[PDB]
């Protein structure tokens, strides 16, 4: 949690938006994944959202689905993903790191134990993609006991009752998926700062989201397509990532 508060307060003083790329841990293998992540941060990522591979990602589109299959081809498991997060944190102490998890991997060895393991490796937030606010109480409580922000998606089909619960239960940031209005209500209910998600794959959409009142943007799959296209040349992959991220970050300024 704290790292988000620090980050947004810093971006607000520079009147800048956050740019937050998503990638699957371990895709296309551990060593190359560590390097992609380092590159996204060197290029200007303000925070990261990191996928843990799960067999049945019923909430992901094809790009991400393929990212998981590459990660599983590499033998990656959640216990390896947590070694990777510990390493990434020991390299970059302030960048907030978010996980995008499926509920079974959080529930598996005990929900409080999952959030205790997050806290020990230095994760700041977790979005459980298949737990709606209705089912979230044990997840949010355990998250809070271990100082981890539980993130919720605020869907376009959201109504008032939902906006109030997402504002009350969420911390760190609200994952936003009448744009200008949703934002105004979230602000009115003092929700965690909104990141516009989905669809974000060019600079002009980053500027647009900040203009609308969001605190920033998250690019849910564009980084992943860059990986997929460049599998044959790891050096060209890093180059285009860096290029893509510097341009999106520039747009948030």
């Amino acid at each position: 949690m704290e790292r988000y508060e620090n980050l947004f307060a810093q971006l607000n003083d520079r009147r800048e938006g956050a740019f937050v790329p998503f990638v699957t841990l371990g895709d296309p293998g551990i060593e190359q994944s560590l390097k992609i992540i380092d590159t996204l941060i060197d290029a200007g990522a303000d925070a990261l959202e990191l996928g843990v591979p799960f067999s049945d990602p019923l909430a992901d589109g094809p790009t991400i689905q393929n990212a998981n299959l590459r990660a599983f081809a590499a033998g990656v498991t959640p216990a390896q993903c947590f070694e990777m997060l510990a390493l990434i944190r020991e390299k970059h102490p302030t960048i907030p790191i978010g996980l995008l998890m499926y509920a079974n991997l959080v529930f598996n060895n005990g929900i409080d134990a999952f959030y205790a393991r997050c806290e020990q490796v230095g994760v700041d937030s977790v979005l459980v993609a298949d737990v709606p606010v209705e089912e979230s109480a044990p997840f949010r409580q355990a998250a809070l006991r271990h100082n981890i922000a539980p993130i919720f998606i605020c869907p376009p089909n959201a109504d008032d009752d939902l906006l109030r619960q997402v504002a009350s239960y969420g911390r760190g940031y609200t994952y936003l998926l009448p744009l200008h209005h949703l934002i105004e209500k979230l602000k009115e209910y003092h929700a965690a700062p909104a990141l516009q998600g989905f669809g974000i794959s060019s600079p002009e959409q980053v500027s647009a989201a900040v203009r609308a009142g969001a605190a920033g943007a998250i690019s849910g799959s564009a980084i992943v397509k860059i990986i997929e296209k460049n599998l044959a040349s790891p050096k060209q992959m890093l180059a285009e990532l860096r290029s893509f991220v510097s341009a999106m970050k520039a747009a948030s300024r």
Partner: protein, 394 residues
Amino acid sequence: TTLLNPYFGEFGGMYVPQILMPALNQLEEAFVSAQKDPEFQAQFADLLKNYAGRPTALTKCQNITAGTRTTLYLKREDLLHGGAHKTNQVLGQALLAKRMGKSEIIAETGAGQHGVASALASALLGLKCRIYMGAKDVERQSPNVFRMRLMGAEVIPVHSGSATLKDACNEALRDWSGSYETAHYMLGTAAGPHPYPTIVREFQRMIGEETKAQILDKEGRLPDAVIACVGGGSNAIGMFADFINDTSVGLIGVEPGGHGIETGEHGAPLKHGRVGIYFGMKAPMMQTADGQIEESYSISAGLDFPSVGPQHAYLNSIGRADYVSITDDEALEAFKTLCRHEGIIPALESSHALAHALKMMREQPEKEQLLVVNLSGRGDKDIFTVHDILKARG
């Protein structure tokens, strides 16, 4: 909140992404409304009776029990239109889709029976139906795929993950999330996020309701036990629901034990898996130690759902139902036995339930017992499979 409880004890729930909440809530309100609407009930009854062929027979099997004190009736869901019980709840769910003004149906299927049921209901009721099925399962179910398509349904193979039922299940939820405004997701078993475990029960409960009426008529008392196979749990919750408050009547669900529970190659999560959260529910599942979801193995293709409906998990937890397993070779033996002594060829899914009844009888041949097995489907579809095995062994 919801109008009905989404939990059976600790199991069940609505573990789906936030964007599908409104779809579920909508379905539950439509359902609660339908259940109090005499007109809806009369239209459902009319299609069950005049199109599907309800009530089905309750057949007494005297040659198989000869020389024992077991009397065995078989509930003949194999004589329903389409050859399985799946047809009952597709009709109910299609009528609900219409009630909500939807004009498309999304379905998932594994062995293809629920796919064929959904494509027949949608042909009859004028809905445009697309069906997801694992590529590996399309590959081994060509006759089923072609029936679906003769009936006008679009069949979409699913190549992600294991290319089997669970992957079709995810794709179907993916699609609904973006189309629930004009499409209904016609889930094929008593599992998945609330309200589906409730809806499917309530649209299969005529099974048990008819069995009670017909066993009282022919024997003047209730059964000692009713026995059904459990893949996701629909045929069995449909046979057990009207008996749950009849405390003397035993409820026994049978999961496929595959090559043997000890081998690990089975499909029996209720008794041999571990609770997890997947497919929108908390329930027992086939999963690795680290929580990846795995496939269920059985000689029968239709007992492949790798978890089980929450209401089964709950009735096992409080001891009102008992769940057992039967292996491939026991199921195959029961399949042969029914064909040769009663002239009925059962689905190999239902042959698991029969094999357990046969073990109850043979293990204790002087115990007096009145048993009803739900014969969930006919086994015309399994003859090639049985032929090949019988051929690989002589």
